[PDB]
Write a protein that binds this DNA or RNA. Structure first.
Ligand code: FES
Ligand SMILES: [Mg+2]
Ligand SMILES: [Mg+2]
Ligand SMILES: [Mg+2]
Lengths: 363, 109, 212, 168, 115
RNA sequence: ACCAGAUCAAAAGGGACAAGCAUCAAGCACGCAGCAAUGCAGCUCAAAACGCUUAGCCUAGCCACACCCCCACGGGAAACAGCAGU
């Protein structure tokens, strides 16, 4: 017949419930504290293979036996046969640049996550007279010292773990193993990134290179963190991004590169960082850094790796005799580094061009 | 009767009893090789529900399709243990037999 | 073999459903009209030629009910098309109304009435159809009885009709084969078939609705 | 030459010879038999020769074997109704066993012919379509009708190329 | 392919080569292509007169009745063919086209005669 | 024309269903009982699991795609794999 409802004591709905959010849900100190103890034996210096503190070791540890451990090797793609040997060599020249071959007696490649080479490292440690005394595990924060320490603790190498003040640190008997504090890295994008952003950026699975053929006057975006502007190139070139598989890579023209950047900062197109304009307001703006590439060494050997700190890098192959001009935009706080290619033959692993898009099918 | 499972009745061999009230039965069907035209024992794994847990590894069992799949894989119930392992009763003479030799002679009674 | 679920597909389905629900257009919007171009502004579609004069000259059911108490509930409403087509009285009793208040003049909405077609009424009041049309008219309170005065004409009609020649031959042959020598002609009953004029009102309850 | 004893067993001509087609009630068949025993020789020969034919004619009827499980050989059929039919085969020849199983569970020639009629119904002569299904693709194949234009050009009167000319 | 809506319809599939029309009376889902899949073929039809001046038509009356019962519709050409056959009443448009042709003939005869 | 069951045929469940590579040998939760808590610790795999590469197919026709992001809210961006045409 008739009924009424009361504009007082109301219960009300909401505007724009945004079920999209619901589905988004659904889907120096070391020098002044620790070096004194260390310089009183063997040192295990862990180096992140992806990120390539070394020159300061003589003061940090002093003149004692040191073994280099290149971590996170499994995440490195196999660009060409013998890449492990090439990496061991590269570490050897790096140490020579910085040290006696402090003396470094062994360079080995390990993957604590996959337990690759840990047993061989244990065998080498136990096989020789030279390795007697205590073991000090030195390295950076992200190097994986925690993972390697846990792996070694869960092994026959140890005779379960104790905590003792050096700062309280973990140890276990072998003489005692010593796990020192990780040396924090300056100018690291991980410092700026949040827990979730860092988790996304850090590759947890084996990296798949992503190649893109670019002509002069174009722009590539590795997330919202890294950008490259390719120009003044006598010929097209190839850029192979080696980074976390879940980091979007976007290609655009130079004109639209900016406008896309402001429009899509954060959000989902550039998944890192996150928080939209709120997060971007605090996020440092991308400062520019100019680069000139050497003569293009063919179309299969990378000429240079442009690394955006720990997020990843891009290997560039220009055409023969071609010299290219580049401008890398990276966050103000962090730094952009041009280095000799860590995987020079990474361009070869690829598929075929898909449509007019610059992308190559990933193999 | 109107069961949604495909094979209504299937005779197989129990090859596992590590599941509560469920027996892992192996069923073998002769299959024609289209080229050689010889028949081969193709085999498939079925899970039979056994409330009494009377299945023993090696038993020959008859499995009846359940009216509906009662689990991700349990689609049959043990209708009858056809040949209790090493406790075979000759269906013809009904007397117990050990391989090809009667335990109780058929002339016993 | 396991499929990768289509989360975005599900979200799109649900979001589109919710958007349609929450922006369901009003009647005053859907069934508007531009008397200059005779185009519905909401969709921009032009009305058919044969409805131009009617749209320009006549009025809508709610456009009339807006000028009556209780929205003229209980009055008899006839359609100009019905009046022109049939000499018999046709109309609705208009038992119930439900206008689209959002309209400025409250000249749109829904209605329910007891149909009287060709002078034969119905057993119940049901939803109107073609409410939004323009061919409606109101029976004045006076003259109502005289207008609705209907003399039931003799309804006797053919009980059956002859079969088509070949079907007749088939049936006869089958009978003779079975031995049923009954020579009575085979006839097809048609009383069972309730022929209705093409313009007879349809069940609005099963009719659809426009969308944006 | 073909491999194995009695290679004839591996030819369609022989496999199709099986005259035993189980009624739809039969679903499983288990053949218990002894690899040794003069009395069980008949069952052995049956398993060696006829079982392939039975399986070929009854693809869905599961068939399983059991060597030296019981002193005497036998067959056992499990029907869709849950009934179990135990057939003794001791001392019987393979042919005798085949005839017995045919009598007790095989469809009769009447039923088989009924199935054949049901099948042939599909192949309606009057229908036209690809040779795979119908006898004639196009009515043009039928004599007296206008022949296909490819083989015999149509008159200029019938070709639309000149109906348009008349239109002009 | 799942079809949104649609219904069975008895119609004609236009086989035959160019300038040589020939029709297969088929019962097919109305949404299916003209010559495409079809539930069942009910007969055939040869528009071109044969050597005897006959437009042969074959109608599987049993199945046609069965499908009409099941609820299949009838395309206008098929309704006209059935009417000619006598299975159905002559189509209203067949009758009216006959009358229009008669009036056309009368007009043309008058015009020719009034020279 | 309504209902009828009939016809047609989705979703869902069961079965079936391409090729090469073992220099792809383990997958890493891939199972079960219980109304549930919860328990059991299992499940597939050298009779080829898992994985990589290639391909539309079993042709009255069938499967899939519809510029891309598998999807398409959204974004990328302005879409002929409809006909003719460049
Ligand atoms: S195939 Fe029949 S006319 Fe050509
Ligand atoms: Mg798409
Ligand atoms: Mg296109
Ligand atoms: Mg085209």
């Amino acid at each position: 017949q008739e009924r009424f409802l009361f504009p007082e004591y109301i219960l009300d709905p909401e505007p724009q419930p945004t079920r999209e959010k619901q589905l988004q849900e659904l889907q120096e100190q070391y020098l002044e504290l620790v070096s004194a103890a260390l310089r009183r034996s063997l040192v295990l210096y862990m180096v992140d293979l992806l990120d390539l503190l070394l020159p300061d070791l003589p003061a940090l540890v002093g003149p004692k036996q040191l073994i280099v451990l290149g971590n996170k090797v499994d995440l490195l793609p196999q660009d060409a046969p013998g890449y492990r040997q090439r990496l061991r060599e590269r570490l050897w020249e790096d140490c020579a640049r910085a040290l006696l071959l402090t003396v470094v007696r062994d360079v080995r490649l390990i993957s604590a996550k996959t337990g690759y080479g840990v047993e061989e490292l244990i065998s080498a440690l136990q096989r020789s007279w030279r390795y007697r005394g205590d073991v000090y595990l030195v390295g950076a924060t992200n190097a994986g010292k925690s993972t390697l320490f846990n792996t070694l603790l869960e092994s026959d190498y140890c005779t379960r773990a104790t905590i003792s003040p050096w700062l309280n640190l973990l140890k276990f008997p072998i003489h005692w193993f010593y796990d020192t504090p990780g040396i924090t890295k300056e100018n690291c994008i991980l410092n700026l990134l949040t827990e979730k952003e860092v988790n996304i950026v850090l590759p947890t699975q084996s990296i798949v290179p992503r190649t893109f053929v670019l002509k002069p006057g174009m722009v590539l975006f590795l997330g919202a963190i890294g950008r490259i502007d390719f120009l003044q190139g006598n010929q097209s070139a190839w850029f192979t991004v080696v980074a976390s598989n879940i980091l979007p890579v976007h290609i655009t023209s130079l004109d639209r590169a900016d406008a896309l950047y402001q429009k899509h900062a954060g959000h989902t197109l550039l998944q890192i960082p996150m928080g939209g304009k709120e997060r971007m307001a605090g996020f440092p703006p991308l400062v520019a850094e100019d680069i000139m590439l050497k003569e293009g060494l063919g179309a299969s050997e990378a000429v240079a790796d442009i690394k955006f700190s720990s997020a990843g890098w891009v290997s560039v192959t220009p055409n023969f005799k071609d010299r290219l001009h580049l401008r890398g935009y990276t966050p103000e706080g962090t730094v952009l580094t041009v280095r000799p290619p860590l995987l020079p033959y990474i361009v070869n692993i690829k598929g075929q061009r898909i449509k007019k898009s610059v992308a190559y099918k990933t193999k | 009767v109107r069961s949604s499972v495909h094979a209504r009745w299937i005779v197989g061999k129990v090859i596992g009893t590590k599941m509560q009230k469920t027996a892992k039965v192996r069923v073998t069907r002769l299959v024609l090789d289209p080229y050689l035209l010889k028949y081969f024992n193709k085999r498939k794994t079925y899970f039979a529900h056994d409330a009494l847990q009377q299945c023993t590894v090696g038993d020959i069992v008859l499995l009846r399709a359940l009216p509906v799949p009662r689990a991700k894989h349990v689609k049959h119930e043990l209708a009858e243990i056809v040949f209790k392992v090493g406790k075979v009763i000759d269906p013809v003479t009904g007397k117990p037999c050990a391989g090809t030799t009667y335990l109780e002679s058929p002339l016993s009674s | 073999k396991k499929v990768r679920p289509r989360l975005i597909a599900e979200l799109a389905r649900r979001v589109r459903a919710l958007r349609e629900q929450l922006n369901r257009p009003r009647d005053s919007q859907l069934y508007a009209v531009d008397y200059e171009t005779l185009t519905r502004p909401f969709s921009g579609r032009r009305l058919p030629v044969r409805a131009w004069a009617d749209v320009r000259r006549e009025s809508r059911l709610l456009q009339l009910l807006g000028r009556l108490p209780l929205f003229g509930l209980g009055r008899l409403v006839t359609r100009k098309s019905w009046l022109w087509q049939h000499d018999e009285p046709c109309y609705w009793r208009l038992t119930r109304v439900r206008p689209d208040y959002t309209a400025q003049n409250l000249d749109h909405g829904k209605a329910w009435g007891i149909l009287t077609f060709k002078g034969k009424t119905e057993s119940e009041a049901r939803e109107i159809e073609h409410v939004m049309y323009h061919d409606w008219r109101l029976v004045p309170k006076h003259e109502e009885e005289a207008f609705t005065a209907f003399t039931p004409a003799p309804e006797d009609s053919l009980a059956s009709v002859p079969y088509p020649p070949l079907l007749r031959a088939m049936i006869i042959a089958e009978r003779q084969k079975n031995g049923d020598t009954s020579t009575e002609e085979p006839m097809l009953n048609v009383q069972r078939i309730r022929m209705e004029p093409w313009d007879y009102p349809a069940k609005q309850e099963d009719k659809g609705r426009a969308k944006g | 030459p073909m491999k194995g004893r009695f290679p004839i067993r591996r030819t369609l001509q022989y496999l199709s010879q099986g005259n035993v087609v189980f009624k739809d009630s039969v679903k499983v068949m288990t053949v218990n038999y002894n690899t040794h025993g003069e009395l069980g020789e008949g069952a052995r020969k049956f398993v060696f020769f006829n079982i392939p034919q039975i399986q070929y004619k009854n693809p869905w009827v599961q068939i399983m074997m059991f060597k030296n499980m019981t002193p005497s050989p036998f067959l056992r059929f499990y029907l869709d109704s849950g009934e179990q039919v135990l057939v003794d085969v001791e001392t019987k020849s393979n042919k005798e066993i085949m005839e017995h199983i045919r009598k007790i569970l095989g469809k009769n020639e009447e039923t088989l012919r009924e199935e054949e009629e049901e099948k042939k119904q599909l192949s309606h002569p009057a229908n036209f379509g690809p040779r795979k299904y119908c006898l004639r693709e196009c009515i043009c194949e039928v004599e007296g009708q206008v022949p296909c234009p490819s083989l015999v050009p149509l008159p200029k009167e019938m070709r639309g190329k000149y109906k348009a000319a008349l239109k002009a | 392919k799942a079809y949104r809506g649609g219904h069975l319809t008895i119609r004609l599939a236009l086989g035959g080569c160019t300038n040589r029309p020939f029709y297969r009376i088929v019962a097919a889902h109305n949404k299916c292509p003209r010559d495409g899949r079809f539930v069942e073929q009910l007969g055939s039809y040869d528009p071109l007169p044969n050597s005897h001046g006959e437009k042969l038509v074959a109608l599987n009356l049993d199945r046609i009745r069965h499908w009409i019962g099941c609820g299949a519709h009838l395309s206008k050409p098929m309704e006209k063919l059935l009417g000619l056959a006598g299975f159905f009443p002559l189509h209203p448009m067949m009758i009216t086209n006959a009358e229009r042709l008669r009036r056309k003939r009368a007009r043309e005869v008058l015009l020719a005669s009034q020279k």
